Amino acid sequence: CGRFFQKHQGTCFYFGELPLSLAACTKQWDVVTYLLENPHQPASLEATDSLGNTVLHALVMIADNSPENSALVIHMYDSLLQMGARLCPTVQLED
Amino acid sequence: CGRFFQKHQGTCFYFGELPLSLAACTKQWDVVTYLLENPHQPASLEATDSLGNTVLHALVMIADNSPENSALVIHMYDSLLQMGARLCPTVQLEDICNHQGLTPLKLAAKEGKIEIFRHILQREFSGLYQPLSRKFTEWCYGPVRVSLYDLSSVDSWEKNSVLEIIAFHCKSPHRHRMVVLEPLNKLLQEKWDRLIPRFFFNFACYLVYMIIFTIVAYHQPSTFGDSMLLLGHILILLGGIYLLLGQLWYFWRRRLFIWISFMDSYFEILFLVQALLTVLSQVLRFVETEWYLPLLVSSLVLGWLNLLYYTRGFQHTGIYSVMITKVILRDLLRFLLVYLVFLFGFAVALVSLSREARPVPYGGILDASLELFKFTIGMGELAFQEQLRFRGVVLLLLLAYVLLTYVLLLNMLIALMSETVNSVATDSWSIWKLQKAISVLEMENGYWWCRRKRHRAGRLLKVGTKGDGIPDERWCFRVEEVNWAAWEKTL
Amino acid sequence: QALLTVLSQVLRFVETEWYLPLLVSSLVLGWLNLLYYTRGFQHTGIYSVMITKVILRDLLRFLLVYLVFLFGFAVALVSLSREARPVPYGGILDASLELFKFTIGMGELAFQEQLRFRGVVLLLLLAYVLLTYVLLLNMLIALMSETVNSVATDSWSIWKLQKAIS
Ligand SMILES: CC(C)CCC[C@@H](C)[C@H]1CC[C@H]2[C@@H]3CC=C4C[C@@H](O)CC[C@]4(C)[C@H]3CC[C@]12C
Numbered sequence: 192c193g194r195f196f197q198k199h200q201g202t203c204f205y206f207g208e209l210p211l212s213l214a215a216c217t218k219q220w221d222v223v224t225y226l227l228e229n230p231h232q233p234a235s236l237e238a239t240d241s242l243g244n245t246v247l248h249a250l251v252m253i254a255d256n257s258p259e260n261s262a263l264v265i266h267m268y269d270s271l272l273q274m275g276a277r278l279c280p281t282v283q284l285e286d
Numbered sequence: 287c288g289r290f291f292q293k294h295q296g297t298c299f300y301f302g303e304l305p306l307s308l309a310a311c312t313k314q315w316d317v318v319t320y321l322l323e324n325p326h327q328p329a330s331l332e333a334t335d336s337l338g339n340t341v342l343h344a345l346v347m348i349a350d351n352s353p354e355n356s357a358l359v360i361h362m363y364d365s366l367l368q369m370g371a372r373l374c375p376t377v378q379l380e381d382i383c384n385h386q387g388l389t390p391l392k393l394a395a396k397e398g399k400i401e402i403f404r405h406i407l408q409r410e411f412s413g414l415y416q417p418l419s420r421k422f423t424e425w426c427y428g429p430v431r432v433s434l435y436d437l438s439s440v441d442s443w444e445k446n447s448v449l450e451i452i453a454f455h456c457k458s459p460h461r462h463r464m465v466v467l468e469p470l471n472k473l474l475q476e477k478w479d480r481l482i483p484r485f486f487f488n489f490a491c492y493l494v495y496m497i498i499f500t501i502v503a504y505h506q507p508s509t510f511g512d513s514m515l516l517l518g519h520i521l522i523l524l525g526g527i528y529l530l531l532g533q534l535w536y537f538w539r540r541r542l543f544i545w546i547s548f549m550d551s552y553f554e555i556l557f558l559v560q561a562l563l564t565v566l567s568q569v570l571r572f573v574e575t576e577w578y579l580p581l582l583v584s585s586l587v588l589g590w591l592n593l594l595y596y597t598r599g600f601q602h603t604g605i606y607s608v609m610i611t612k613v614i615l616r617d618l619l620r621f622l623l624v625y626l627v628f629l630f631g632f633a634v635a636l637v638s639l640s641r642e643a644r645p646v647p648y649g650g651i652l653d654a655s656l657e658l659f660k661f662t663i664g665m666g667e668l669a670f671q672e673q674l675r676f677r678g679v680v681l682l683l684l685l686a687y688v689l690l691t692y693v694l695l696l697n698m699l700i701a702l703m704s705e706t707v708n709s710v711a712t713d714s715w716s717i718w719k720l721q722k723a724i725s726v727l728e729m730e731n732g733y734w735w736c737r738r739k740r741h742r743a744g745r746l747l748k749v750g751t752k753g754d755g756i757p758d759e760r761w762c763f764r765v766e767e768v769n770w771a772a773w774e775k776t777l
Numbered sequence: 778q779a780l781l782t783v784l785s786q787v788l789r790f791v792e793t794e795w796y797l798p799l800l801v802s803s804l805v806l807g808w809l810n811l812l813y814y815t816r817g818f819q820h821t822g823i824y825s826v827m828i829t830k831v832i833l834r835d836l837l838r839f840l841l842v843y844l845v846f847l848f849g850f851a852v853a854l855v856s857l858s859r860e861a862r863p864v865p866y867g868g869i870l871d872a873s874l875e876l877f878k879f880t881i882g883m884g885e886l887a888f889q890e891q892l893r894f895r896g897v898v899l900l901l902l903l904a905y906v907l908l909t910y911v912l913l914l915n916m917l918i919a920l921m922s923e924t925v926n927s928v929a930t931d932s933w934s935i936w937k938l939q940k941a942i943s
């Protein structure tokens with residue numbers, strides 16, 4: 192959490208202030224995957240931030256109406272939803 | 287140097303009157319290369335000609351707005367720049383002046399050539415040949431990317447900048463297209479944003495002056511009140527003198543704009559005329575001449591149109607004001623020409639007719655013209671005059687005028703205005719942006735009595751190290767952007 | 778409308794003379810709300826949306842320019858024509874009313890013979906007519922044509938959102 196990381200008017204880029212959120216927003220499916228199957232300590236896919244946003248909220252926040260950004264956020268959203276289904280099929284992330 | 291080789295109107299082809307310039311302009315990279323590595327005598331790449339142009343100036347001169355020519359001149363320009371870097375890395379070719387005083391970048395601005403101008407203004411190369419670049423991409427943390435544009439010889443802080451050349455020196459008709467490109471667009475916008483208070487302060491001062499003028503003109507006859515009237519009159523005299531001095535100073539500073547610029551400014555003449563009329567009326571009052579009042583009311587009329595001048599400070603109203611003048615110029619004058627040709631003949635026919643019976647309507651030419659104009663203003667008296675001897679002929683002439691000037695011409699004028707408004711949508715935006723640029727450039731300088739201090743734009747960002755020493759400093763303008771396609775391409 | 782109606786009704790109890798203007802203002806404003814209720818059909822709903830979009834996009838610039846033209850010419854006409862060789866253009870309101878009669882199609886354009894500056898007055902009137910009536914009104918028609926052409930598809934979605942809100 193910092194001035195550059197919060198959403199304001201100026202020099203900033205909000206990504207969810209989470210390593211998993213950053214990896215998802217930066218278009219790397221391999222890094223997102225690897226954080227999840229760590230034997231040491233897996234990254235919880237339902238963790239939140241100061242604003243309370245999750246990995247799925249952050250993707251919505253960084254979304255634009257441009258074609259490429261929309262395609263990227265759609266694909267990442269679907270992939271993360273499937274990954275949440277295979278990891279944790281009890282809790283549903285959409286609600 | 288010869289008649290065929292100089293730039294004139296007729297049979298000519300200017301190429302720089304140099305073998306190296308000819309080879310560069312004739313699309314042969316091998317010949318250009320070979321002239322440079324001759325053991326006998328290499329061809330100096332910084333040599334000039336009678337006009338003083340170099341190899342880079344000549345490429346700018348022969349440039350056109352066609353795609354193929356623009357691509358050729360761009361590629362040759364970049365190749366020659368790299369070749370100059372490898373041969374002579376001490377001297378830089380871009381800042382070589384001319385006999386006129388211009389650089390290759392300033393020639394592109396003054397000659398109205400836009401493709402090479404936009405390419406030179408924003409260029410970036412790969413890892414090799416960094417120093418000879420204008421746009422530099424700084425940190426790329428995620429999809430947000432920050433660009434740094436070189437502000438050298440393009441910032442209005444210097445004496446003869448690119449913006450001043452475009453606004454007051456370019457001969458091209460469509461010279462506004464150059465002020466709506468990236469760097470200039472952003473820089474001009476922030477300059478205008480910094481200049482809102484002074485612009486609206488000038489507007490308020492002019493509004494107060496016009497209110498005082500209106501009050502003085504209204505409360506004037508054919509003590510305290512007399513003292514206030516005299517104070518108002520002398521204040522108007524000084525205000526008119528001030529406006530006249532300002533207009534004269536503006537005309538003297540840019541002696542040669544009056545041919546290039548009429549579509550965009552066209553208010554300096556109006557301000558000059560208003561000031562002259564006001565001063566002339568005020569001085570003529572001292573003689574107690576009867577022609578005071580017409581001159582005073584003419585100045586009163588012309589003042590509020592300059593108030594409309596001050597109104598072009600917003601996007602909607604500015605484009606509307608541009609469109610008004612463009613509609614006036616493109617199609618109002620043809621309609622007036624045809625209208626008066628119709629009016630004069632019909633009025634003369636009506637006057638010559640209806641002089642014998644069986645006051646008097648159509649007594650003279652002025653009365654007939656007034657009646658026929660009442661027809662177009664919607665107040666035409668169309669009656670069957672019974673006392674006339676040629677009643678049917680008069681009625682037929684009136685009907686023929688009505689169905690041929692009122693039904694046809696006015697509605698056709700409406701249609702032509704519709705077409706004109708449809709056709710010039712995108713042009714008015716650029717014209718208004720150029721108008722804002724001119725206003726900003728004028729406000730950057732002070733008034734004719736006080737000069738503002740030049741506020742430099744951009745920050746002093748280090749852009750690395752050159753091959754001559756450790757420091758390499760240049761003033762750059764920063765712009766942020768959030769681009770997702772470009773970011774995803776670079777991985 | 779509700780505030781004006783309630784204020785007029787309560788002001789009647791005081792027997793104040795400003796009852797009737799407030800009551801007639803409420804009466805005027807009621808039928809425009811009746812037009813509110815009219816946006817229940819596709820054609821009329823999109824028409825109502827287009828009316829407001831034409832008003833917002835281009836009616837205000839025209840009024841601004843129109844009043845700037847009107848005020849200066851009216852003041853010039855009032856300051857002029859105060860000496861001879863009732864009286865037309867007696868004050869600012871009368872001059873404004875005459876110049877507006879010009880745009881409503883009832884402009885009295887005559888060569889006043891009793892004035893001392895007949896030619897100047899006639900030239901000013903002609904310059905107002907050919908610059909406000911011929912130019913500005915027809916240009917306004919053209920701008921409305923362009924606006925109606927440009928916003929065809931947007932009004933449908935705006936009306937659908939209006940239905941959703943209702
Ligand atoms: C009685 C006389 C002095 C008033 C008539 C004005 C005369 C000078 C004519 C000549 C050229 C005309 C101007 C040229 C075009 C414009 C730009 C437009 O955006 C506002 C109206 C305005 C400014 C016109 C107003 C009328 C005009 C000024």
Ligand SMILES: CC(C)CCC[C@@H](C)[C@H]1CC[C@H]2[C@@H]3CC=C4C[C@@H](O)CC[C@]4(C)[C@H]3CC[C@]12C
Nearest residue numbers: 802803805806809810812824825826828829832
């Ligand atoms: C004498 C006075 C009270 C009557 C004039 C009405 C006043 C309030 C003005 C101000 C804003 C205007 C309204 C704004 C826009 C619309 C929507 C349009 O689809 C119907 C007309 C209508 C409703 C206008 C009617 C006139 C209006 C209501």
